[PDB]
């Protein structure tokens, strides 16, 4: 089932496969981001997914990589961080959550990625729900499968991003 | 349930909880091994579990970390490597298999560990089974739980081992 990711050729097909797998687990929007070992900026990043273009552009332009609490979490942990104003603290973090919400990305989680060759990144996934309690139930229900998925995505994605011609 | 590891008082309780979780999942033998970022040897290694003393000693004395096919795998991948005939390619690797088997460790898997601060390790677990078919069925039934377990063990073990 996860073998399809390795089987695919090209970032187009790979991203579509990952998006479908995530959708089948109940997540309508995902972002897979991966950096080479000891990256000092985002110039060499591999970023694929179906987050809206407007949000992608805004997050970049507003410098949210330095605000987003899930980013610093990824540098410190292999465990997922669930999206909660709570991981929000500062005024800019308040701004970030408000704007993410406005973009339609309210509930979700970010799974850190730490590759065998020092690759650093995340698979972030948003879930549409009536409320946070329901979102949490949807997410808990698929957490073991998502845990496998994130490592399969890391192993195959690192190859696609940085290695395969 | 997994957070019991990080909520443990220290090394002794952490090891007992880890071994108990594994046992409850159906694995009577486990080994958690973790090295700090960019290790030259095993002088600062954090190694915990209930592998038999005799086998621990033999592996060290034989220098099996240079032969064990799961070790090289861990340096290349985040995915588990199951203990199957195909992973033992050379006679030296076959001899390793036979010695591990003679020690009681025949069926199992090794989960690579790659920490946020460059920690490198493995969580290995062995199941006592009658044959390969029974071993495989059992491991497939628990694999998703084990997959979460290894990351919780890593995050808590790294915090315990190097801080
Ligand atoms: O992919 C990465 O960051 C990015 C990048 Br780039 C662009 C966007 Br747009 C979003 C993210 C990550 N945040 C989220 O997904 C998120 C989190 C909480 C609430 C809402 C959202 N949300 O809706 O965006 C990344 C991962 C690891 C590292 Cl170490 C560095 C960067
Ligand atoms: O913990 C580590 O290795 C060790 C160390 Br030390 C001591 C012993 Br004893 C065993 C291992 C790992 N092999 C196994 O468990 C195994 C695998 C297949 C078949 C049989 C067995 N088996 O029965 O031992 C380690 C992990 C990552 C790195 Cl990068 C380096 C070392």
UniProtKB/Swiss-Prot annotation, chain A:
Job of this protein: Transcriptional activator of elastase structural gene (LasB). Binds to the PAI autoinducer.
Keywords: Activator, DNA-binding, Quorum sensing, Transcription, Transcription regulation
Transmembrane segments: none
Cellular component terms (Gene Ontology): protein-DNA complex
Lineage, uppermost ranks: Bacteria, Pseudomonadati, Pseudomonadota, Gammaproteobacteria, Pseudomonadales
GO aspect biological process, one term: regulation of gene expression
Entire-sequence positions represented here: 6 to 170 of 239
Similarity-based family: Belongs to the autoinducer-regulated transcriptional regulatory protein family.
Protein name in the entry: Transcriptional activator protein LasR
Additional information: LasR in strain PA103 is not active, this is probably due to the change in position 180 of the sequence.
Protein species of origin: Pseudomonas aeruginosa (strain ATCC 15692 / DSM 22644 / CIP 104116 / JCM 14847 / LMG 12228 / 1C / PRS 101 / PAO1)
């Amino acid at each position: 089932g996860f073998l399809e990711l390795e089987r695919s050729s090209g970032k187009l097909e790979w991203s579509a496969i990952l998006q479908k797998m995530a959708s089948d687990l109940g997540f309508s929007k995902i972002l897979f981001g991966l950096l080479p070992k000891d990256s000092q900026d985002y110039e060499n990043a591999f970023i694929v997914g179906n987050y809206p273009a407007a949000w992608r552009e805004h997050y970049d332009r507003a410098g949210y990589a330095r605000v987003d609490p899930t980013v610093s979490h990824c540098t410190q942990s292999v465990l997922p961080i669930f999206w909660e104003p709570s991981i929000y603290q500062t005024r800019k973090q308040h701004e970030f959550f408000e704007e993410a919400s406005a973009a339609g990305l309210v509930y979700g989680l970010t799974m850190p990625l730490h590759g065998a060759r020092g690759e650093l990144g995340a698979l972030s996934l948003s879930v549409e729900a009536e409320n946070r309690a329901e979102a949490n139930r949807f997410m808990e229900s698929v957490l073991p499968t998502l845990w496998m998925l994130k490592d399969y995505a890391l192993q195959s994605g690192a190859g696609l991003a940085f290695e395969h011609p």
